[PDB]
């Protein structure tokens, strides 16, 4: 019954048409977005076709009072193919033409913006260790997990936040979910390129100090990781988030080493080991 999913998205039921037009257009699935555009596209042409027919027989070589011909003319005119069979006739016909033209290009301008707006989004090639572990590092128990860069390109001034979210009781007895940012031994990595094992030493200042497993479940506590940095691939900022529940903490565990030796003998990175955690089993 977790508050936060693995993907980092909160896991809650929200309780609440043209209101949020811009957001919606960027939020919709490509299929739908294209459909919407198409719909609008056809629609307006039909509208214009009617405008033409309304004037009546104002298009060269058009079957009298036929919507098809008018519609197709309308597209040839708005897309500015303008083949040349169907042609405007008289002031009314033509004014509608120069109006449509403008409309066509404006549509393109709007379409383009939308396309570019939804198209130009990078994604940090970052993978999160499926688990966290708590183990002795440098003489103090330390909470940790690790990121692996999935691309050849590097991420500059990358940095990461490890935030504990758990329930608390105030002196006044208010019961709330609070956020604790956990001091990391290393929060900045000016050049993140392969793997980074993040660590939160646990001492008298750690909000999880002298805390067992039982105690973590009891505060219904989770752990949220936010990574961000500047990806050279895209020459633009990227970010990635991930969340762990109390039960994804492997106590006593140690992340295996991803750095391996081949028959060639050169050091290599194996992403397979990335999720592997060493563990002592004591019967």
**How many other C-beta atoms are found inside a 10 Å radius of the C-beta of residue 178?**
13
Q: Could you tell me which stretch among 46-54, 98-106, 201-209, 244-252 binds a copy of itself (CB under 8 A)?
A: 98-106
Of 236, 212, 214, 239, which Cα lies nearest the Cα of 225? 239
Which of 55/234 has CB closer to a copy of itself? Answer: 234
Please give the residues from 185 up to 214 whose contact with a copy of itself meets the rule CB under 8 A.
Answer: 186, 189-191, 193-194, 197
- Total of residues contacting K ion (CB under 5 A): 3
Task: Give me the least distance between CB of 235 and a copy of itself, in Å please.
Answer: 5
Written as six digits, the tokens of 134 are: 């708590």
Q: What's the Rg (C-alpha) of the chain?
A: 30
Angle at 272 between CA 268 and CA 274, to 5 degrees: 85
Which of 3/250 has CB closer to a copy of itself? Answer: 3
Is residue 120 at the binding interface for a copy of itself, with CB under 8 A as the rule?
yes
Please give the residues from 77 up to 96 whose contact with K ion meets the rule CB under 5 A.
Answer: 80, 82, 84
> Exactly one of 35, 98, 212, 279 binds a copy of itself (CB under 8 A); which one?
98
Which of 15/18 has CB closer to a copy of itself? Answer: 15
Please give the residues from 227 up to 256 whose contact with K ion meets the rule CB under 5 A.
Answer: none
- Total of residues contacting a copy of itself (CB under 8 A): 109
Q: Could you tell me which stretch among 10-18, 47-55, 203-211, 245-253 binds a copy of itself (CB under 8 A)?
A: 10-18
Crossing angle of helices 30-55 and 67-78, in 10° steps, is 120
Of 190, 189, 192, 196, which Cα lies nearest the Cα of 128? 196
Cα dist from 153 to 66, 231, 269, whole Å: 58, 7, 15
Is residue 228 at the binding interface for a copy of itself, with CB under 8 A as the rule?
yes
Task: Give me the least distance between CB of 37 and a copy of itself, in Å please.
Answer: 8
Is residue 59 at the binding interface for a copy of itself, with CB under 8 A as the rule?
no
DSSP string, 194-252: SEEEEEEE-STTSTTTT--HHHHHHTT-EEEEEEEEEETTTTEEEEEEEEEEGGGEEET
Task: Give me the least distance between CB of 97 and a copy of itself, in Å please.
Answer: 7
> Exactly one of 36, 55, 156, 250 binds a copy of itself (CB under 8 A); which one?
156
Is residue 18 at the binding interface for a copy of itself, with CB under 8 A as the rule?
no
Is residue 61 at the binding interface for K ion, with CB under 5 A as the rule?
no
DSSP 181: E
Angle at 149 between CA 147 and CA 154, to 5 degrees: 130
Q: Which residues does residue 277 pair with via DSSP β-bridges, in sequence order?
A: 255
Which of 13/283 has CB closer to a copy of itself? Answer: 13
**Site residues (vs K ion, CB under 5 A):** 80, 82, 84
């Amino acid at each position: 019954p977790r508050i936060l999913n693995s993907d980092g998205s909160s896991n809650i039921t929200r309780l609440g048409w043209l209101d949020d037009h811009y957001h919606d257009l960027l939020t919709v699935s490509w299929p739908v977005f294209i459909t919407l555009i198409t719909g609008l596209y056809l629609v307006t042409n039909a509208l214009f076709a009617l405008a033409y027919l309304a004037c009546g027989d104002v298009i060269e070589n058009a079957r009298p009072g036929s919507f098809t011909d008018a519609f197709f003319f309308s597209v040839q005119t708005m897309a500015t193919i303008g083949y040349g069979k169907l042609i405007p006739i008289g002031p009314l016909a033509n004014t509608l033409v120069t109006l449509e033209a403008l409309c066509g290009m404006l549509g393109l301008a709007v379409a383009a913006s939308l396309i570019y707006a939804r198209f130009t989004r990078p994604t940090a090639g970052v993978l999160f260790s499926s688990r966290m572990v708590i183990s002795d590092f440098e003489g103090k128990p330390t909470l940790m997990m690790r990121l692996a860069n999935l691309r050849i390109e590097q991420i500059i001034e990358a940095d990461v936040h490890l935030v504990l979210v758990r329930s608390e009781i105030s002196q006044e007895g208010m019961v709330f979910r609070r956020f604790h940012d956990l001091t990391l031994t290393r929060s900045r990595s000016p050049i993140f390129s392969l793997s980074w094992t993040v660590m939160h030493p646990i001492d008298h200042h750690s909000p999880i100090y002298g805390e067992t497993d039982e105690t973590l479940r009891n505060s219904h506590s989770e752990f949220l990781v936010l990574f961000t940095g500047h990806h050279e691939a895209f020459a633009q900022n990227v970010h990635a988030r991930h969340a762990y529940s109390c039960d994804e903490i492997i106590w006593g565990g140690h992340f295996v080493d991803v750095f391996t030796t081949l028959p060639d003998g050169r050091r290599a990175l194996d992403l397979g080991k990335f999720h592997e955690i060493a563990q002592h089993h004591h019967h």
